Amino acid sequence: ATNRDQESSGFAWWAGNARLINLSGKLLGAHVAHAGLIVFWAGAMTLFELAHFIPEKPMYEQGLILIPHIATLGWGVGPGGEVVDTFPFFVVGVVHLISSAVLGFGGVYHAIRGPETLEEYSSFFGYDWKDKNKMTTILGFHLIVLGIGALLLVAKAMFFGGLYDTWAPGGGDVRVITNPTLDPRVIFGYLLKSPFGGEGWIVSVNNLEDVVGGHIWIGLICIAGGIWHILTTPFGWARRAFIWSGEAYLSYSLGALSMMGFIATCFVWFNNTVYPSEFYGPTGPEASQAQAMTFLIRDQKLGANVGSAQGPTGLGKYLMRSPTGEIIFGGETMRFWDFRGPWLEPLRGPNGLDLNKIKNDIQPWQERRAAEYMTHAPLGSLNSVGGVATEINSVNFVSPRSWLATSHFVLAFFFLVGHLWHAGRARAAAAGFEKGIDRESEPVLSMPSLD
Amino acid sequence: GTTGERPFSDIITSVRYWVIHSITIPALFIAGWLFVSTGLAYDVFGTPRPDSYYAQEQRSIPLVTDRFEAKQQVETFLEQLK
Amino acid sequence: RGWFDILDDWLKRDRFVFVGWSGILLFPCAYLALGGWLTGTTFVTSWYTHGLASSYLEGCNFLTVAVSTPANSMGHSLLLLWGPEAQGDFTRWCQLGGLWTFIALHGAFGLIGFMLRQFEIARLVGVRPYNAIAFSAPIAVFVSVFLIYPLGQSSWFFAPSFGVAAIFRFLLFFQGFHNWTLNPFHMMGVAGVLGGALLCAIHGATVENTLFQDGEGASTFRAFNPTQAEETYSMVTANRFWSQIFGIAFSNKRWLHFFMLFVPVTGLWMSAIGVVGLALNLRSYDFISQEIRAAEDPEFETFYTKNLLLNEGIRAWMAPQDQPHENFVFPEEVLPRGNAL
Amino acid sequence: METLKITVYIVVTFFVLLFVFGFLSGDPARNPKRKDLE
Amino acid sequence: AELTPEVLTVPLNSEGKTITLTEKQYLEGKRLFQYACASCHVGGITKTNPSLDLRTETLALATPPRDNIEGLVDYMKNPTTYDGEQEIAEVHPSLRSADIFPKMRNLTEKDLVAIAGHILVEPKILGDKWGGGKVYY
Amino acid sequence: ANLWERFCNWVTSTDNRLYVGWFGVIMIPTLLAATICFVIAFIAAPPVDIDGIREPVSGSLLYGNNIITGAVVPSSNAIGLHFYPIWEAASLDEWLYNGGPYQLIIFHFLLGASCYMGRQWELSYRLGMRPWICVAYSAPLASAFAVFLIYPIGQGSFSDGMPLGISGTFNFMIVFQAEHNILMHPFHQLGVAGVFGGALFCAMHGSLVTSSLIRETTETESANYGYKFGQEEETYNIVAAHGYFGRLIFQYASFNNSRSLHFFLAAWPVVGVWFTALGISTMAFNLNGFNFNHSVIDAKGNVINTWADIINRANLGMEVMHERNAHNFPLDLA
Ligand code: CLA
Ligand code: CLA
Ligand code: CLA
Ligand code: CLA
Ligand code: CLA
Ligand SMILES: CCCCCCCCCCCCCCCC(=O)OC[C@H](COP(=O)(O)OC[C@@H](O)CO)OC(=O)CCCCCCCCCCCCCCC
Ligand SMILES: CC1=C(/C=C/C(C)=C/C=C/C(C)=C/C=C/C=C(C)/C=C/C=C(C)/C=C/C2=C(C)CCCC2(C)C)C(C)(C)CCC1
Ligand SMILES: CC1=C(/C=C/C(C)=C/C=C/C(C)=C/C=C/C=C(C)/C=C/C=C(C)/C=C/C2=C(C)CCCC2(C)C)C(C)(C)CCC1
Ligand SMILES: CC1=C(/C=C/C(C)=C/C=C/C(C)=C/C=C/C=C(C)/C=C/C=C(C)/C=C/C2=C(C)CCCC2(C)C)C(C)(C)CCC1
Ligand SMILES: CCCCCCCCCCCCO[C@@H]1O[C@H](CO)[C@@H](O[C@H]2O[C@H](CO)[C@@H](O)[C@H](O)[C@H]2O)[C@H](O)[C@H]1O
Ligand SMILES: CCCCCCCCCCCCCCCCCC(=O)O
Ligand code: OEX
Ligand SMILES: [Cl-]
Ligand SMILES: [Cl-]
Ligand SMILES: [Fe+2]
């Protein structure tokens, strides 16, 4: 029981995992076991979703979050997102589960039975947190692996089946991407776009060509950067800029992951390209716009001249102008005039929504889709009662977009707290005062008074 | 310092404690269960059963409206249930 | 020794749970209040007093169960089990809401007993009585809310019912009918509560981050000994930090801790005064100048007038079911409503 | 309005650059106990 | 009160003949109604067209009359506008549009009868609440 | 030393009456801008068309408000989440009509408050303290982010951010209850536990220390003069305080360790407020409080009301009355 008590390690049980900071073998075992946990959940949860899946009903009516991910990749679904074959879902679940068993075996071995420290057994796998060269070597290895993952996505899109394209001409379909966007102007203009309304930063990516080109660039850049960090060691300015310790590296990663969690929240809330509404349900903006469209259709069928219908406030009841003049839906949904979706874009012309097209060319499938989205807006209670808070019990529905956004905002925030905690502690421990103030050399006592 | 009572950990890790309580705890739990499943709770506390909130064709609540006749009003409501 | 002195000895024995003379009042009353709440929430209905289901036995959950107030027709009756209403019939007593007055009265006397316990223990161990003094705020809140307010209103019916959701309904009723948020006494109460939470957090964190290193462990809790004479954290360093961060800082620990007593206690007392006012419908409901201006000028609008519209909605839509004794029938056409909703 | 926009861009860039280069200017060594943190 | 056979007895055709639904029938109807219809018709209102509701009187005044089991089954097979002038299977769920409304694909004749029975019974239980909207919540 | 070296030494100096630091270099200008704009707007700004329906709401003192009713009004629903700096307006008149001051103020404030947290860390580092006071500050800061940025992002408009005023805050709260039933949401319940318990424990700790002060003064002098700033010995008897509180409840319910005690004081309210901030930030994506409307039904099928149904009636009143001219269609979907 080496270092497995507070007396010998300096750490209490509630901080026990800090006892592993300098025990590389047991720490590797811990990480492999936790990765086994991740893979195991993927497999078990996917199998649970499949066992509870009713193929006829939309995915988003059934509390599914993983099956939509598989379907978006083009597996198991056909035109309009209809499910034609669930065996790909089942295969994903089974394979992840078996792999989880293997990972668990490896992690338990490295954590319980294998060498406690790897430095003696091997210098290739052993490391010292303060060895910047070795640290950057491991970082580069994992960068190469990640780049390979991005290129795997590219391969799925281009050579093995393609991706589900909600924008495909005909009403959404699996499509093979053959002309990925390699234009750096486009790819990095995305990064330079403002995050505010009508711009949306990277969350605004609205076509699979741009998606695939972006991931091509990510894979190549990651491979090059990993080779770079294998072959180099940090320069002097970096050496003087950073804290070089295990806890510091953990803190940096906590900050990065928090940022990624917030970004994912926005992605799933706003983007209906890589999160097709056929699978994840309408976005909030989409559902609001859909209500506007639905009642425009109903009243116009009754005989209203929607272009000229004046609302109570003087603004158009059904149609008005955005602050830059585009014709848009009226009512509160004026805030959502940046929304774009395949069921709505056929009605849009150069100046915005086109009155002639609204009057003459709205199709039954558009009417049906608008009704569906209006009635599956992402609003619901914690016990999964669909609709506004004042609605009565009857509909058992909370949108996958709501579940995913809320969960990952919670995770991103707590990981920001983690970044702050571990970064502050890393600084204090590197400087040597993380256990408190030295009584005989209290820094403040040697400073001049403020007044 | 301690006040002389036997330690709780000592008591709850002892064979005699569990000899006694493996009988007593289940008995009390079953007593409560039966208190409900036999319907005695309804009678004791005057709580309506699912079929006793309304008369068959009634939709008005049996609200007590007189302070000193409230007991008789409740009894009249109960009779009207029949 | 005399029997009084022998009894004093036994009551003040040092045992796991101290009893004391105050115990003779505290323990039966506190037990009866708590047990009454659990009993009512588990088995008792609110059908004959409110037209509501309020117990686990009827199908409510922890958030919706309650021991509900008696019917409005009961007035302010004590509703004693042997009283003229229940006439010694336990089942009828429960159906008439005697459990609410039972809980409220045994709980009030239990609070008296607990404060007496604070005094008695302080006297026995030789400390000053400031914990008992600070407890006056919870007692003032309880008295003002659960006894004085209903005593000023038509009956116990409008006191808070002992339950989670029932308390929430109490909040919303106060907003809708009293415009309680606009009341400067509630505002001072809010300041006291939130400032107390702020002081609690900031002081805890400051101590924990100005600790002296008094041991080698990375977990710093073992480096304190209760009998030690030295301060465990650096007041000088904490004062320097807060002076440079926020401009001002504490420099006197005694003042710091008295201030921690003073803030939340004073806030709760102020809120109690406000509720005494509301017992008489003596509200901070309106600003007369704004009302005159708005009446004369249909383009004048502020968040104050918006909130008044919200209150009118609350009253109209909740009164018929929340006040069943009034027999309100509001035809649909009279309900206030905005466009389309 | 264009002059205002350019002025604000210049000011913000000034302060942000101060932030970045200041934290690059050997910040870890600016503590009372141990300087050589690499 | 109880869910009695008298409550469960509802009109069967346009000639006044009545049928007595079983309690299992009524519960199955409620479940199927939640499954296939409540997204728009929760509580008897119509979210995407509030002017039309599922109240028995409204069904009675519909053309053809829909205040009986057979009328409601026919509506679910071949829905029409209120005056019966237009067939709206293209925009309303039905067996003949089950290809575009998949939740209708597996419904059987007994299932449709159960849904219709639920629609007719629920107002007998809830009164104005059925089709009344938020005013009566 | 070179000019840059001297400037860095001044910026990071621990001898300045108010610490500046690198976080302060961002904090000072942004907080000054936010403060100046807020004060000017609160006093003098003209009415703002918050809901985008050409119905301006008056927020400023000079336009008929008092301290309780005044506010800086959120930007127009016509703007949504669009960035609306002064230079995006055709004129200051347009900017004011559309509520640009709100955006300027809240953005500069959020940035400055983030830098305030960082500055707490930085000065702790300069003074050789432990670093986690900033972690305590992250709770209220997270709450500010939730009500000024996250909720607007989720709902699609800064017009739904909390107004910068007292009555505006109340309006925000009431509408929030109408649309999300926050009272029935466990995270707000944890927030209430956090703040009620924070106040409770504040009073408890203050009262216990005050009750255990050691005699160093006479009855004609404030007991506070019994403590001298920077004295080595403790000023109260924690052993006596523990004897009292342990006998008040029972021995093992009372802290005998001051460090554990102060950690608990920090942790309770901070965690509670973290959770309430998450409650707002998750209801931003329309995951609302528990809905038990009509959960209890009798044998026939009659609805048996509960206190939750009464709450629902109140919520309906709020919902139907709020923003009375802004809705054209039956559902309020954001
Ligand atoms: C990659 C993520 C990561 C990693 C690897 C670490 C690793 C570490 N942290 Mg850091 N931490 C993180 C994220 C991370 N942390 C985040 C996000 C936060 C913010 C909350 C913190 C906050 C934090 C603090 C405050 C401290 C550490 C400490 C530590 C060390 C000991 C941890 C331990 O033994 O826990 C033991 C684990 C437990 C005691 C169990 C905790 C269970 C949590 C609180 C509840 C989880 C609920 C669950 C999700 C859902 C439950 C469902 C139920 C409600 C039904 C270790 C070096 C300690 C340290 O400084 O050591 C040097 C320390 O004091 N961490
Ligand atoms: C993902 C979560 C996770 C992981 C991977 C680890 C991993 C580890 N912890 Mg940590 N820990 C955690 C959570 C976690 N911990 C939490 C939540 C707490 C707070 C309660 C702690 C508190 C804590 C302390 C206080 C200590 C550790 C220690 C350790 C290490 C040695 C454990 C040991 O000696 O086991 C001994 C235990 C056993 C022999 C019992 C059996 C354990 C096995 C692994 C169960 C596996 C079951 C599994 C189903 C088998 C599948 C096999 C199949 C695939 C074939 C190990 C690397 C110790 C350490 O660092 O030592 C240097 C240490 O002292 N941990
Ligand atoms: C990142 C995870 C990781 C890392 C860094 C290590 C590292 C190490 N392990 Mg451990 N191990 C792991 C996972 C890991 N292992 C898992 C998951 C298992 C369970 C099967 C084991 C089971 C295991 C045993 C039983 C033993 C080791 C031993 C060793 C040491 C020698 C390994 C060697 O020479 O490789 C030789 C290289 C190979 C055999 C080729 C590996 C390439 C694989 C098969 C495919 C390509 C890799 C690819 C990226 C995998 C993708 C998986 C993805 C889905 C996650 C070394 C310290 C030995 C030791 O400690 O000696 C004292 C030892 O006896 N490991
Ligand atoms: C997991 C990813 C990862 C990580 C952790 C690192 C880590 C590191 N790299 Mg490597 N790098 C990577 C991937 C990564 N790299 C890849 C993929 C490439 C290929 C393009 C490189 C290419 C590369 C080079 C060429 C160099 C490094 C260097 C370094 C070191 C200094 C980093 C630094 O100062 O950053 C902090 C960054 C800065 C100080 C400059 C930019 C700071 C701006 C102002 C921040 C902008 C934030 C933005 C405005 C806010 C929103 C973000 C939004 C745009 C997403 C450090 C060890 C340096 C070194 O010493 O290596 C020998 C070096 O010269 N890296
Ligand atoms: C210290 C303990 C204590 C206290 C302060 C109270 C206080 C109260 N109880 Mg609770 N009660 C207690 C213990 C206590 N109870 C216990 C242990 C039980 C369980 C047995 C109960 C069971 C209980 C029930 C069931 C009810 C109460 C009720 C009440 C209220 C009315 C009491 C009343 O009118 O008494 C009046 C009695 C006295 C003031 C005693 C006077 C004693 C003098 C000396 C008598 C002198 C004359 C007399 C004829 C002596 C004759 C001597 C000779 C001729 C033989 C009051 C709030 C009622 C309530 O809550 O209503 C809503 C109610 O219904 N109590
Ligand atoms: C030393 C503690 C310092 C840490 C601070 C604690 C944080 C706060 C914890 C509070 C809850 C305590 C959890 C126990 C913390 C703990 O350490 O537990 C251990 C403690 C003592 O356990 P043992 O008897 O095993 O003690 C071993 C001893 O030999 C020495 O430890 O157990 C109890 O006190 C639990 C008994 C429940 C007693 C229920 C009695 C009910 C009586 C009802 C009347 C009440 C009085 C009413 C007054 C009006
Ligand atoms: C170290 C440590 C730890 C951790 C641990 C872990 C984390 C582990 C993991 C583990 C794992 C991670 C495991 C795994 C497992 C797995 C398995 C064992 C699997 C199996 C599978 C199967 C058997 C399948 C089957 C099937 C199929 C194939 C098809 C479908 C159906 C079914 C499902 C039946 C703790 C915390 C305790 C603490 C101490 C130390
Ligand atoms: C995939 C994809 C794409 C693309 C993407 C990309 C291309 C990306 C990139 C990205 C990137 C490229 C990023 C970057 C980032 C960076 C960062 C995030 C940084 C940070 C930094 C830091 C953190 C710093 C710090 C500091 C300072 C500032 C001062 C001094 C000290 C220190 C150093 C600490 C797209 C959209 C097209 C589409 C979809 C898909
Ligand atoms: C009123 C009255 C009375 C009294 C009564 C009593 C005294 C009662 C009591 C009762 C009681 C005394 C009851 C109790 C009950 C209890 C319960 C019912 C409990 C529950 C619990 C729970 C459910 C919990 C849970 C949990 C969680 C969740 C987590 C953590 C852990 C725990 C376990 C805590 C007399 C006779 C004078 C007559 C007149 C009237
Ligand atoms: C917008 C992009 C901005 C960030 C771009 C990335 C820049 C990365 C490379 C820049 C390197 C800066 O290099 C860094 O310069 C500073 C300031 O002179 C040096 O700082 C050093 O000299 C200065 C004097 O000027 C002293 O005040 C300081 O205490 C000392 O550390 C650092 O030792 C060096 O590491
Ligand atoms: C101060 C101490 C107060 C203690 C009061 C204990 C109360 C115990 C009451 C139990 C008996 C109730 C009498 C029931 C019969 C009364 C019927 C009637 O004549 O009205
Ligand atoms: O702006 Mn403010 O408050 Ca949110 O929900 Mn819709 O939008 Mn309006 O209505 Mn309700
Ligand atoms: Cl409003
Ligand atoms: Cl609208
Ligand atoms: Fe203290």
Side-chain angles (χ1 to χ4, degrees), chain A residues 29-30 33-34 36-37 40 47 90 94 97-98 100-105 107-108 111-112:
Chain A
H34 185 266
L37 292 175
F40 176 109
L47 296 183
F90 178 78
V94 172
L97 190 57
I98 304 293
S100 86
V102 171
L103 289 174
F105 192 102
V108 169
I112 298 302

Side-chain angles (χ1 to χ4, degrees), chain F residues 11-299:
Chain F
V11 166
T12 57
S13 173
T14 58
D15 294 358
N16 288 328
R17 175 60 180 84
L18 297 169
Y19 184 70
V20 176
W22 296 116
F23 281 108
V25 160
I26 301 299
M27 180 191 76
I28 288 162
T30 56
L31 288 190
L32 283 172
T35 299
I36 295 173
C37 187
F38 170 81
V39 173
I40 297 175
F42 195 90
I43 294 171
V48 171
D49 185 24
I50 177 181
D51 289 332
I53 52 168
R54 316 300 173 78
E55 182 189 343
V57 175
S58 178
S60 73
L61 297 181
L62 285 172
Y63 287 73
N65 286 276
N66 62 30
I67 290 294
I68 302 300
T69 71
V72 181
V73 177
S75 54
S76 170
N77 190 46
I79 294 171
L81 291 180
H82 284 238
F83 185 59
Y84 193 58
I86 295 185
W87 58 82
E88 277 292 324
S91 68
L92 279 176
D93 294 314
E94 171 202 312
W95 185 69
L96 297 169
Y97 181 93
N98 288 275
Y102 181 82
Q103 282 197 12
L104 188 159
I105 291 165
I106 62 162
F107 294 160
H108 282 86
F109 168 78
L110 288 174
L111 182 49
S114 302
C115 291
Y116 189 94
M117 186 172 63
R119 174 168 171 269
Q120 284 180 328
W121 162 81
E122 187 181 342
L123 178 56
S124 74
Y125 189 67
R126 310 301 187 213
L127 298 184
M129 299 163 43
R130 282 140 56 77
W132 295 309
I133 289 176
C134 68
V135 170
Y137 178 68
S138 76
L141 181 57
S143 302
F145 265 95
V147 297
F148 289 143
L149 184 62
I150 305 309
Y151 192 68
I153 291 174
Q155 300 301 302
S157 178
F158 286 109
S159 69
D160 276 349
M162 191 181 84
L164 308 183
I166 294 165
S167 293
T169 293
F170 304 151
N171 183 262
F172 178 86
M173 297 174 79
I174 299 166
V175 173
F176 214 104
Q177 167 63 18
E179 278 153 32
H180 304 280
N181 208 1
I182 180 170
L183 289 177
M184 292 291 282
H185 193 298
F187 282 8
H188 183 266
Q189 291 164 9
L190 285 170
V192 175
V195 298
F196 276 176
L200 193 179
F201 300 140
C202 185
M204 286 294 312
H205 183 57
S207 65
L208 289 173
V209 173
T210 302
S211 299
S212 50
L213 296 188
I214 295 165
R215 186 177 308 115
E216 304 281 342
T217 59
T218 59
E219 68 177 345
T220 65
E221 315 171 319
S222 175
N224 296 336
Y225 287 114
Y227 171 88
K228 306 293 183 307
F229 176 62
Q231 69 179 52
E232 290 170 25
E233 67 270 30
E234 191 45 77
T235 199
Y236 69 102
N237 188 337
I238 189 169
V239 173
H242 178 57
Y244 169 82
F245 188 50
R247 294 183 169 78
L248 182 63
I249 306 303
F250 58 84
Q251 178 177 354
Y252 308 107
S254 173
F255 299 96
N256 70 2
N257 187 327
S258 178
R259 298 193 169 190
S260 305
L261 167 59
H262 287 84
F263 173 67
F264 175 83
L265 295 181
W268 186 272
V270 167
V271 173
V273 170
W274 278 340
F275 272 108
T276 201
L278 294 172
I280 297 297
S281 306
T282 54
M283 284 170 275
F285 306 102
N286 303 321
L287 181 60
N288 303 331
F290 285 118
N291 174 340
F292 303 119
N293 295 326
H294 296 195
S295 282
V296 183
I297 308 295
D298 77 356

Side-chain angles (χ1 to χ4, degrees), chain C residues 32-275:
Chain C
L32 288 184
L34 171 69
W37 186 70
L38 293 160
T39 301
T41 55
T42 300
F43 299 113
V44 174
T45 191
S46 306
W47 191 235
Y48 303 100
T49 63
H50 286 70
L52 299 176
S54 59
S55 54
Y56 300 132
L57 179 59
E58 296 171 291
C60 298
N61 62 50
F62 166 71
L63 297 182
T64 60
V65 294
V67 174
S68 300
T69 52
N72 184 69
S73 59
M74 316 312 293
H76 303 101
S77 175
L78 294 166
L79 283 196
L80 309 177
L81 172 53
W82 53 90
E85 299 85 1
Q87 297 172 229
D89 186 323
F90 175 83
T91 306
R92 298 287 175 263
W93 185 62
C94 288
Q95 293 172 320
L96 295 174
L99 276 192
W100 189 93
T101 62
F102 179 92
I103 292 175
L105 296 173
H106 284 95
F109 282 103
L111 292 173
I112 298 179
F114 189 89
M115 192 160 167
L116 289 173
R117 175 187 187 85
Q118 288 167 315
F119 277 123
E120 181 170 20
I121 296 183
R123 186 65 275 191
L124 285 173
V125 303
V127 298
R128 317 161 82 207
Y130 286 84
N131 184 236
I133 292 171
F135 199 64
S136 63
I139 289 185
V141 172
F142 181 83
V143 172
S144 62
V145 174
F146 286 84
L147 298 177
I148 296 181
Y149 176 76
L151 283 171
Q153 297 293 339
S154 62
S155 67
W156 302 120
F157 179 92
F158 291 100
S161 290
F162 292 103
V164 170
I167 282 293
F168 298 159
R169 166 272 174 195
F170 193 73
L171 305 174
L172 300 179
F173 178 99
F174 268 49
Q175 177 53 48
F177 290 78
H178 295 306
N179 210 8
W180 181 219
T181 45
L182 204 75
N183 194 305
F185 289 100
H186 186 253
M187 293 167 171
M188 292 190 286
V190 169
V193 168
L194 297 184
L198 182 167
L199 287 167
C200 186
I202 199 173
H203 178 57
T206 297
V207 169
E208 283 300 284
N209 286 273
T210 57
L211 302 178
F212 289 114
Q213 171 167 6
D214 289 333
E216 298 305 301
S219 300
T220 57
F221 296 99
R222 292 205 190 272
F224 177 87
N225 186 312
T227 57
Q228 73 186 60
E230 309 74 41
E231 63 172 357
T232 195
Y233 66 97
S234 177
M235 192 75 181
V236 176
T237 297
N239 167 276
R240 177 70 164 243
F241 175 89
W242 286 116
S243 300
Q244 293 186 277
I245 286 294
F246 185 65
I248 66 167
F250 288 102
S251 68
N252 184 304
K253 290 188 57 163
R254 302 192 162 196
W255 166 245
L256 184 170
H257 290 83
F258 174 83
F259 191 67
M260 291 184 65
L261 182 165
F262 175 87
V263 167
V265 172
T266 303
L268 256 67
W269 268 94
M270 295 301 95
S271 65
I273 292 176
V275 167

Side-chain angles (χ1 to χ4, degrees), chain C residues 312-333:
Chain C
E312 289 146 24
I314 292 170
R315 292 197 296 269
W317 285 71
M318 86 176 294
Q321 289 173 41
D322 186 58
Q323 303 177 38
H325 64 273
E326 294 288 4
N327 302 291
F328 287 137
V329 171
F330 293 167
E332 170 167 359
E333 66 197 57

Side-chain angles (χ1 to χ4, degrees), chain A residues 275-331:
Chain A
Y275 299 90
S277 298
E278 300 87 321
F279 308 138
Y280 290 93
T283 67
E286 187 160 26
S288 183
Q289 298 270 290
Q291 175 172 234
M293 168 100 294
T294 293
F295 281 94
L296 187 163
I297 292 170
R298 190 202 66 161
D299 296 359
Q300 183 176 243
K301 278 183 175 183
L302 293 178
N305 284 330
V306 303
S308 58
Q310 178 188 354
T313 67
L315 294 168
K317 184 177 302 181
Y318 310 97
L319 302 165
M320 58 178 281
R321 284 188 189 271
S322 81
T324 44
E326 293 79 9
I327 305 304
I328 68 180
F329 284 130

